[PDB]
Structures are given as structure tokens and as C-alpha cells.
Amino acid sequence: VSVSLDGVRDKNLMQLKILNTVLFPVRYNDKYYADAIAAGEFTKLAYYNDICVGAIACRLEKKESGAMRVYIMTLGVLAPYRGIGIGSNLLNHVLDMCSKQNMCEIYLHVQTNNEDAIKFYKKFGFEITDTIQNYYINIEPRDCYVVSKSF
Numbered sequence: 623v624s625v626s627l628d629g630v631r632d633k634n635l636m637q638l639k640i641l642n643t644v645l646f647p648v649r650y651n652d653k654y655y656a657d658a659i660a661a662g663e664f665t666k667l668a669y670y671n672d673i674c675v676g677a678i679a680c681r682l683e684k685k686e687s688g689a690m691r692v693y694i695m696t697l698g699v700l701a702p703y704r705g706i707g708i709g710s711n712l713l714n715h716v717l718d719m720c721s722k723q724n725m726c727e728i729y730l731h732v733q734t735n736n737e738d739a740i741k742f743y744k745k746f747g748f749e750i751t752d753t754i755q756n757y758y759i760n761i762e763p764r765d766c767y768v769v770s771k772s773f
């Protein structure tokens with residue numbers, strides 16, 4: 623699939639906000655957006671068929687060891703454009719960037735009943751490494767897996 627990726631900045635931020643409003647249940651706060659922009663190459667908008675149709679947004683975090691890791695905050699593709707590889711293109715980009723920028727780990731939280739997502743991330747080498755009950759993945763407490771991949 624021919625996907626064109628662009629960084630997120632003030633000038634195209636509203637594109638990401640629109641995608642999130644369609645894809646995710648509640649308004650994301652301004653620290654999500656600041657963290658996404660600050661994550662650099664790890665946050666991308668996807669363009670296909672001359673339209674912005676998806677995004678991946680990460681936060682970068684420093685561990686006490688000195689090591690660095692990537693947290694996937696959101697990954698999503700608009701419904702009419704799913705199943706043709708755009709979401710895989712976004713995640714492959716981020717995984718490649720983990721290696722290039724010497725990240726030790728990437729991880730995210732997935733609600734425990736979100737079988738589609740667990741299946742999706744395991745295809746890319748992720749594994750469940752923890753279970754957190756009543757985690758605030760959005761605004762309500764939900765049981766979640768920590769889903770991670772080590773480098």
C-alpha cells in the first residue's frame with residue numbers, strides 16, 4: 623500500500639483532532655497533543671488517496687535505568703480505509719524508528735476484552751507482559767493488558 627506519512631505540528635494538529643473525535647470516545651487533553659508532537663518521528667499522520675485517513679501518536683519516556691521507551695497513545699485508521707495495510711504501515715514506521723533511535727521497548731495498554739487489538743499487535747511481535755485492573759485508559763477504569771515489544 624502507498625501511504626504518505628507526515629509529522630504532526632501546530633499547522634496540521636486539527637487533522638489529528640478530527641481523526642480522534644471520530645475514532646475515540648472522548649476528547650483528548652492538551653498534554654496528549656503536546657506529548658504527541660514532542661515525540662517527533664514516532665507520531666505520524668497517514669495520507670492515502672490524497673486524504674488524511676489515519677494516525678499513530680506516541681509519547682516518549684525515560685526510564686530510571688537511563689533507557690528510553692515508546693508508549694503508543696493512539697493508533698487508528700478511518701473506517702472506509704481499513705484493511706488495506708495503512709495501520710500496519712503506521713506501526714511498521716514506528717517500530718523501525720524504535721530500532722533506528724535505539725529505543726529499548728515499546729508498549730501500550732489494551733482493554734482485556736479488545737481481542738481485535740491484541741490479535742493485531744501480536745502480529746507485529748508484541749506480547750502481553752502485565753495485567754492492570756481498573757486502569758484509566760480513557761476516562762473510565764477498565765481492565766487492561768500491558769502489551770509490549772522489546773529491542
Ligand SMILES: CC(=O)SCCNC(=O)CCNC(=O)[C@H](O)C(C)(C)COP(=O)(O)OP(=O)(O)OC[C@H]1O[C@@H](n2cnc3c(N)ncnc32)[C@H](O)[C@@H]1OP(=O)(O)O
Nearest residue numbers: 695696697698699704705706707708709710730738739742
Ligand atoms: C491503544 C491502542 O492503540 S489500541 C488500538 C485499537 N484501535 C482500534 O481498534 C481503532 C479501530 N480500528 C482501526 O483503526 C484499524 O482497523 C487498525 C488501526 C486496528 C488497523 O488499521 P488497518 O489499516 O485496518 O490494519 P491493516 O489493514 O494494516 O492490517 C489489517 C489488520 O487489522 C486488524 N484489524 C483490527 N480491526 C480491523 C478492522 N476494523 N478492519 C480491518 N482490519 C482490522 C486485522 O487483524 C487485520 O489483520 P488480517 O487482515 O491479517 O487479519
